[PDB]
């Protein structure tokens, strides 16, 4: 009761397509459109780091 006090609120929206598309170029930046639809089609692969 003494320590605990009202914690403020935020809602942030985070888009994973922008997180990976904006990836720092020391890792290969990619939008999920062109890797989902070929890692569906082929049994292996990766992008980013």
């Amino acid at each position: 009761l003494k320590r605990d006090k009202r914690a403020l609120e935020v809602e942030r929206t985070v888009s994973l397509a922008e997180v990976y598309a904006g990836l720092p170029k020391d890792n290969g930046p990619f939008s999920l459109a062109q890797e989902i639809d070929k890692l569906v089609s082929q049994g292996s692969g990766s992008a980013g780091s």
Partner: protein
């Protein structure tokens, strides 16, 4: 010829006991703290305590 006087001891004293009291000072209130509960809830809380 002279018969001596038959001096005779008095009653025992009543033993007496002393009954003294002890005293200790009045208490001191803590510092009050403000908290986030509307009064009816903090009252049901304290009443339980």
């Amino acid at each position: 010829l002279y018969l001596p006087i038959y001096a005779t001891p008095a009653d025992p004293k009543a033993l007496l006991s002393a009954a003294v009291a002890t005293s200790q000072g009045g208490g001191k209130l803590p510092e009050s703290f403000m908290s986030l509960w509307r009064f009816p809830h903090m009252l049901e809380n304290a009443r339980g305590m």
